[PDB]
Amino acid sequence: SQVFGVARIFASFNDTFVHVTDLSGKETIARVTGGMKVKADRDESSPYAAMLAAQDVAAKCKEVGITAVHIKLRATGGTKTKTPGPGGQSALRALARSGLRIGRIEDVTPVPSXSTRRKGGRRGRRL
Amino acid sequence: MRDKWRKKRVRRLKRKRRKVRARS
Amino acid sequence: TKRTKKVGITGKFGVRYGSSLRRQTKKLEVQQHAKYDCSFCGKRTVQRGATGIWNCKSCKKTVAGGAYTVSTAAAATVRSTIRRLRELAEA
Amino acid sequence: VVDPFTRKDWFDIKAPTTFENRNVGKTLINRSTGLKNAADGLKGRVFEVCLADLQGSEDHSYRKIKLRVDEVQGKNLLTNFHGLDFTSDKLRSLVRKWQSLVEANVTVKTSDDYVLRVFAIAFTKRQPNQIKKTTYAQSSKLREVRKKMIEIMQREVSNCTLAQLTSKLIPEVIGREIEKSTQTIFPLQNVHIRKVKLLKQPKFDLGSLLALHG
Amino acid sequence: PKKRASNGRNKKGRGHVKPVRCLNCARCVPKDKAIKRVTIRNMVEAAAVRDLSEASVYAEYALPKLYNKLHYCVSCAIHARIVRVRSRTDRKIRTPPQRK
Amino acid sequence: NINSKLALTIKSGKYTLGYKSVVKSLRTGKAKLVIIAANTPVLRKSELEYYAMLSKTPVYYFQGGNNELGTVCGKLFRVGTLSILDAGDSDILSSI
Amino acid sequence: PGRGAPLAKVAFRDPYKYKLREETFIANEGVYTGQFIYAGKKASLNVGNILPLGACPEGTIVSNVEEKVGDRGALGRTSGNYVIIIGHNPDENKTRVKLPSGAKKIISSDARGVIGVVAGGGRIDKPLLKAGRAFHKYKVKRNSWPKTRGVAMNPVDHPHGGGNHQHIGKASTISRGAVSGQKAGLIAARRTGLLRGTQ
RNA sequence: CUUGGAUUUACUGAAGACUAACUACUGCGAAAGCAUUUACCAAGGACGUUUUCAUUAAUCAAGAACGAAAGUUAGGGGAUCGAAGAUGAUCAGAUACCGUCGUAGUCUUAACCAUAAACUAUGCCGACUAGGGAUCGGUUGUUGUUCUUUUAUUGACGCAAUCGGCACCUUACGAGAAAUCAAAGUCUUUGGGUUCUGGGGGGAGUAUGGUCGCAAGGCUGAAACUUAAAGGAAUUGACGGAAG
Ligand SMILES: [Zn+2]
Ligand SMILES: [Zn+2]
SS3 per residue for chain C: CCCCCCCHHHHHHCCCCCHHHHHHHHHHHHHHCCCECCCCCCCCCEEECCCCEEEECCCCCEEECCCCCCCCHHHHHHHHHHHHHHHHHCC
Q: How far apart are CA D78 and CA D50, in angstroms?
A: 18
Core vs surface per residue G25-46: b (16+ CB within 10 A) or e: bbbbbbbbeeeebebeeebebb
* Residue numbers in F near C39 (CB within 8 A): 39
Cα distance between the two ends of chain A: 54
Measured distance CA(G89)–CA(G96) in Å, rounded? 8
Nearest to A101 by CA among E65, E53, C82: E53
CA G13 from chain centre, in angstroms, equals 30
| Residue in chain A lying closest to E48 (CA) | A93
**Cα distance between residue G26 and residue G45, in whole Å:** 18
Cα E3 to ligand 2 centroid, rounded to whole Å: 20
HEC assignment per residue over chain E: CCCCCCCCCCCCCCCCCCEEECCCCCEEEECCCCEEEEEEEECCCCCCCCHHHHCECCCCCCCCEEEEEEEECHHHHHHCCCCCCCCCCCCCCCCCCCCC
Neighbours of chain F (3+ CB pairs under 8 A): C
The residue among A46, A59, A32 whose CA lies nearest residue A88 is A46
Half-sphere exposure of C34 (CA within 13 A, CB side): 15
Under DSSP, the state recorded for G87 is E
In whole angstroms, what separates CA D85 from the centre of its chain?
5
Task: Provide the residue type at A40 as one letter.
Answer: A
Compute the distance between CA of residue G86 and CA of residue G61 in angstroms, rounded to an integer.
10
Q: How far apart are CA G123 and CA A50, in angstroms?
A: 66
E strand segments, F7-72 = 14-17, 33-36, 59-61
Q: Which chain E residues in 43-62 lie under 8 Å from chain D, judged by CB atoms?
A: 58, 60-62
Q: Are the CB atoms for A59 and A32 separated by under 8 Å?
A: no
d(CA E68, CA E47): 22
Pairwise CA distance, residues G106 & G63, whole Å = 15
DSSP-assigned letters across all residues of D107-172? EEE-TTS-EEEEEEEEEEPPPTT--SS-B---HHHHHHHHHHHHHHHHHHHHTS-HHHHHHHHTTT
Q: Residue F73, Cα to own-chain centre: how many angstroms?
A: 10
The C-alpha atoms of residue E60 and residue F87 are separated, in whole angstroms, by 82
Q: Which of D3, D5, D64 to mutate to test the interface with A (most CBs of A within 10 A)?
A: D5
Strand residues in chain F grouped as ranges (E): 14-17, 33-36, 59-61, 81-86
Q: How was this structure determined?
A: cryo-EM
Collect all residues with Cβ–Cβ distance below 8 Å to E75 and sequence separation of at least 6.
E25, E27
Helix (H) or strand (E) holding G190: none
Rounded CA separation A89/C71 (Å): 64
Going from the Cα of C46 to the center of ligand 1, the distance in angstroms, rounded, reads: 7
- What single-letter DSSP state applies at residue F51? H
| Ligand 1 centroid, distance to C62 Cα (angstroms) | 8
Is-contact A110 A116, C-beta < 8 A? no
Dist CA E35 CA D193 (whole Å): 34
Angle between helices D139-158 and D162-169 (to 10 degrees): 130
Q: At what angle do helices F19-28 and F42-55 cross, to 10 degrees?
A: 20
Q: Computed from CA positions of residues D139, D143, D144, D149, in that sequence, does the dihedral angle turn out positive or negative? A: positive
Span from the CA of E28 to the centroid of ligand 2 (angstroms) = 9
β-bridge partners, D197: D83, D117
E6: left (phi over 0), alpha (psi -120 to 50) or beta: alpha
Q: What is the phi/psi pair of residue D205, to 5°?
A: -110, 95
- Whole-angstrom distance, CA of residue G78 vs CA of residue F88: 58
Chain C residue numbers with beta carbons less than 8 Å from the beta carbon of G125 are 24, 28, 67-68
Binding site of C for Zn(2+), by residue number, is: 38, 41, 56, 59
The amino acid sitting at C33 is: H
Contact D104, D149 (CB under 8 A): yes
Ligand number, closest to the Cα atom of E78: 2
Q: Around Cβ E58, how many Cβ atoms within 10 Å?
A: 16
CB atoms inside a 10 Å sphere around CB A46:
19
Q: Which of C24, D182, C2, E75 is nearest to C13 (CA)?
A: C24
- CA distance to C76, C82, G45, G87, per residue, from C90 (Å): 21, 12, 9, 19
Q: Nearest nucleotide to B12 by CA–C1' distance? A: H216
Residues of A in contact with E57 (CB under 8 A): 2, 68, 101-103
* Angle ∠(D76,D61,D15) on CA atoms, nearest 5: 15
The candidate with the shortest Cα–Cα distance to E52, out of F56, A92, G156, F90, is A92
G99 burial (CB, 10 Å; 0-12 / 13-18 / 19+) is middle
- Chain center to CA of C26: 13
CA-to-CA distance for G71 and G34, rounded, in angstroms?
27
DSSP 8-state secondary structure symbol assigned to residue D54 = H
The alpha carbon of F35 is separated from its chain's Cα centroid by a whole number of angstroms, namely 3
Neighbours of F17 (CB within 10 A): 18
Query: How far are the Cα atoms of D115, D118, D164, D168, E11 from residue D109, in angstroms, in the given order?
Result: 4, 10, 13, 15, 47
Contact at 8 Å (CB) between D118 and D106? Answer: yes
Q: Do the two chains C and G touch, given a threshold of 8 Å on CB pairs and at least 3 pairs? A: yes
Point out which residues pair with G83 in neighbouring strands: G62
Q: Cβ distance F33 to F55 under 8 Å?
A: no
Chains in contact with C, where contact means 3 or more Cβ–Cβ distances below 8 Å, are F, G
Report CA(E15)–C1'(H191) in Å, whole number.
38
Distances from the Cα of E32 to the Cαs of C19, E13, E28, E68, in angstroms? 50, 13, 12, 18
> What's the reported resolution, in angstroms, to a tenth?
2.6
CA count, 13 A, side-chain hemisphere, A18: 34
Rounded CA-CA distance D119/D105 in Å is 5
Minimal CA–CA distance to G98: which of G84, G119, G82, G79?
Answer: G84
Q: Which of B6, D43, D154 is nearest to A24 (CA)?
A: D43
**Kind and range of the H or E run holding G105:** strand G104-108
What SS3 state is found at G114?
Answer: strand
All residues of chain C having their beta carbon less than 8 Å from the beta carbon of residue F41 are 40
